[PDB]
Symmetry: D2
Subunit: 230 residues, 4 copies
């Protein structure tokens, strides 16, 4: 059975993604940085739906630790068919007021996270010889920019460029690579045409569609789920 890793899936959008992918018939491996009991509850929900699940704990910024954990996980459970890079981080503030930590933690969590998680998993995915799915979570801020978010806009825009480039490299192996860019999600309203925040499942549904076999001709794309914001 095809297995998908979802980062930051103990709560929020990542949890909704994990549950929808399980309902669609994937085995789903849960991940969190620190909330272990929260991760175990999601694992139990996925098992209740009739799929296999377990969780992995790591900080996506810990390059060597992430490599070791994922290498061992692939050895024990096989390569991942899909990877959803959902975990990210903000440190909002006017640009001249941003601290070194405000900048670096935001940039690294998204972009180091992309490299650190995907580098150990590309070859195990290719070796499944059945295509694959990679979906990154960006933001409307990565497309348009946002005041107080020069760091977050840069990190989420960088994720878009990484996604498009990797789509080109992996297309020959039938691995699609796409990005989902949420707007304002429940986990400003009078700029949103639909006049409300989005719900976590409204984001997860797009990720689930892209991970489905039906989405086989979609790659290199940024799909905005933002109530019409842009």
């Amino acid at each position: 059975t095809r297995r998908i890793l979802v980062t930051g899936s103990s709560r929020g959008i990542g949890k909704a993604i994990a549950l929808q992918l399980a309902k669609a018939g994937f085995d789903v491996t849960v991940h969190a940085r620190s909330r272990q009991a929260e991760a175990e509850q999601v694992v139990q929900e996925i098992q209740a739906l009739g799929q296999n699940s377990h969780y992995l704990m790591f900080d996506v910024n810990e390059r060597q630790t992430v490599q070791q954990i994922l290498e061992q996980d692939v050895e024990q459970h096989g390569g991942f068919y899909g990877v959803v890079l959902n975990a990210g981080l903000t440190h909002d503030g006017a640009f001249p007021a941003l601290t070194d930590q405000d900048w670096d933690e935001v940039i690294s969590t998204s972009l180091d996270g992309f490299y650190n998680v995907l580098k150990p998993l590309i070859m195990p995915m290719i070796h499944l010889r059945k295509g694959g799915r990679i979906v990154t979570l960006s933001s409307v801020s990565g497309i348009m920019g946002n005041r107080g978010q020069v760091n977050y806009s840069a990190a989420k825009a960088g994720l878009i460029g990484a996604t498009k480039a990797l789509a080109l490299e992996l297309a020959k192996r039938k691995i699609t690579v796409n990005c989902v860019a949420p707007g304002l999600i429940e986990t400003a309203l009078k700029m949103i045409p639909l006049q409300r925040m989005g719900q976590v499942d409204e984001v997860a549904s797009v990720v689930k569609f892209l991970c489905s076999d039906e989405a086989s001709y979609v790659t290199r794309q940024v799909i905005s789920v933002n109530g019409g914001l842009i």
Copy 2:
């Protein structure tokens, strides 16, 4: 039961959309310019899939005839919950050698088709008081331009602009309005990252997703289904 009109649905991408929407549980009204027997075959297939169907015949450029047929159809069968605008013609050629007919028929079929089909249907959709779905079919040529298709690129780009503007007007009614832009599809290669033409169902699947209740926070969007071309 919610009913969706799909223009140009007797064959090709439009037929695949009609059949996918029927499998999803919508009643589907078929449309064709002239191929009556082909349209009736799709109607019979939708009925075999367990939904209600009939067909409507009209040239989308015939403004008054379209209005009469659609107003009569809404009177007999109720307003449409969804409309999929699959209305397009090519007349390729170098721009200075395009004839008046090459230009006008390509512009009108897409842009007059949008006005002629949707104007009689917006208020019947709103009066359902249950939201709604409008999906237009553009093209990669509408996003990027293409040699020999100044007319078609203009028409399909114009469709994108009309789609985004209508999304803003109808958002308060919970009617999403989106555009699907296919690349090179089998019904029409070293440039396509996936190294193959798309299949009609690979386009129809994206239209079907957008028409689903799950896609409720996606509006004002152009989703490309092009194997990575752009």
Copy 3:
């Protein structure tokens, strides 16, 4: 001397473009739909700047008239090195409420204007054997859409697609083809609704001046812009 046609150049943005191009050293041919005296005033200002000018009168929708006038003008004065297409009108309203004319006149003025004006001029431009410049004027509404302007957003988006496709056909001729998409500009006829909605969303918190648009067109028409083609350049104060 290289000659550039600017449509709708008797007032507003089009006049600002014509004057900036004359100052840059181009001969500039003025055009207007109906206000002949207004057009003649711009001609006189261009002549006073030291370049050749005259004006042409036509509705850009009258296809055969446009062709006859333009072919006669090219016979008398030579091919145009540049064409700036400044053509379009608004007929705002909610989509269910748009009349047939509200829709058709907005679509045709932008898109038939493109075909009607440029089709007779491409080969005379090519025959100059010195490259060329085509700049179309779209709008921020053609990029992102706008309430009450389903017709206008479609017309100006279609202008973008036509521009990009033509850029591909003419690139080997060293003719660049680009689009300038203004946001909310002084002298542009806009509803109070559209003007209020725009002002709250513009980061620079003001309307643009006509010369802030004309300067971008002037730059694209310069020899320096020779590697810029197929582009839509937004001049909108940060709106998008």
Copy 4:
């Protein structure tokens, strides 16, 4: 009354062309290089021969504290910069599975930490000039659409676009425009005959761009005439996209 602009990586190539065009437009221009000091001094003398004031600054844009100290000392001695052009960047090409840690980290940091390290000490001195300002970043067509063998560079140059757009929003009220120029294939980029051959078939103009064709766009955005252009990515790519 004279306005001064810093151009990173201006001892050669596109950055040099930008510096010389800005000098010809009437700005004083401060040259920068990571290590090629003699090369930077040659550009300084050309700017001086063009009729403007110039000197050079040497630093790796990744050396955050060294950059802060050099820029704060420069502003104390010569006044705030009216403009900053972030041209210096770095590639380390290779398929994503082939990339080393250094290949990834050096490319991401040079563009994105370079943005922070150079601009953070300069934003307030720019604002305190009370006469607007100009910031232009140099991205790449790869940052817009991605490129095989450049997952790292595509990420770095796409991130630069997000930073540019966000900063434009913050600084608009100070009449500082913030824009990005995204070159295509330019004559300074070393490519094999095979790669060049393939690339030329994809570019509608069917040739590489010249350094001045890029610099002209930067020079326009830095001009007073470009006062209503902000938050934009302007592609200079011969029609590639």
